[PDB]
Amino acid sequence: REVRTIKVFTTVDNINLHTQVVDMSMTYGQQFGPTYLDGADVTKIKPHNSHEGKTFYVLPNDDTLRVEAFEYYHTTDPSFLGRYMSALNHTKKWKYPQVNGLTSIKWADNNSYLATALLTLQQIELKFNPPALQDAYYRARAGEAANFCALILAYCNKTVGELGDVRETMSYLFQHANLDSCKRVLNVVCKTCGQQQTTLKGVEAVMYMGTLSYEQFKKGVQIPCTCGKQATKYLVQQESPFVMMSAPPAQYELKHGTFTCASEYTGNYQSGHYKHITSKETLYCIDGALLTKSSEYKGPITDVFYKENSYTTTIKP
Ligand SMILES: Cn1ncc2c(Nc3ccccc3Cl)ncnc21
């Protein structure tokens, strides 16, 4: 019969704010359904004076919100916002030191794979299609990386605390990147079967699993033919700002100025730790918040990133 009310804003995207007047006697839950304040689940909290004028996230439960959510995130996955908020609640508590002019993450909750991915993303040319991802990437480049990390988690369907794979993370993120112009032309040659050429576009044009060396891919790599015998696969043409070469972790020597950055993986599928090696004026090894320099580097490398623009082979088949 006596009611206290505050004004708050609800949103799915943090750009379109929708005015609400809420009753302080009931929970946010009772009023909006699942509600979050800066990542924290406030579904079962009651509105408080300090809340007046703040923005709360809600799940998209009307047509306007569904459209906004889709336009912002480019996903219709009903669990997405929940998982993002959940992740954000953890990532907002992590530390993001500047290390050698790059935003890193101090180790917490098995986040070594995310630190490595975050560092990599700052050194290759990539534009994301979902406004959420692109906005968050710009802020992460500027030093505020908590949202970006939470979004990477939500898009890769990974929970805070779980061991992650960098190659898999890059692959999922790449699905949301504009890589439509990227083109790869391959040739596979059999002394018996002949020469078979393949054109790839998009994510598949910038990724390779089986060798770390971009040079080796240009020169030719041995693979089975349908004939049963050994054929040569080699890169004919590449049009992309970068390429990613991956392989199961093995001892490998990184030579200064022959690549942009690399992932080191110590461990197996059940446990392990990533470190990031970048080529600048010398070799930097970024391990979360820790930085070491060296002229040479030899370690279990699993991904290497190289710069590219437009490459044509000099091989005449
Ligand atoms: C021997 N081994 N252990 C892991 C692994 C791998 N993927 C992976 C999975 C989880 C975390 C990190 C990575 Cl690199 N790919 C190839 N060989 C691998």
Numbering used by the authors: 0 to 316
Lines from the paper:
SARS-CoV-2 papain-like protease (PLPro) plays a key role in both viral replication and host immune suppression and is highly conserved across the coronavirus family, making it an ideal drug target. PLPro cleaves the C terminus of ISG-15 (RLRGG) with sub-μM affinity allowing for the virus to delay the immune response, resulting in increased levels of infectivity for SARS-CoV-2 compared to other members of the coronavirus family.
Class A compounds share a similar binding pocket to other known SARS-CoV-2 PLPro inhibitors, GRL-0617 and the peptide-derived VIR-250.26 Like other inhibitors that bind to the S4 subsite, fragment 7 engages in π–π stacking interactions between their aromatic ring and Y268. This induces a conformational change of the BL2 loop from the unbound PLPro structure to form the exterior wall of the binding site. Despite their structural similarity, the methyl group at N-1 is the key to the binding preference of the compounds. This nitrogen is observed to create a hydrogen bond to a water molecule, which links to K232 in the finger region. Once it has been methylated, the hydrogen bond formation is disrupted, resulting in binding to the S4 subsite in the palm region. All class A fragments displayed some degree of inhibition of PLPro at 1 mM with the most active fragment 8 showing 62% inhibition.
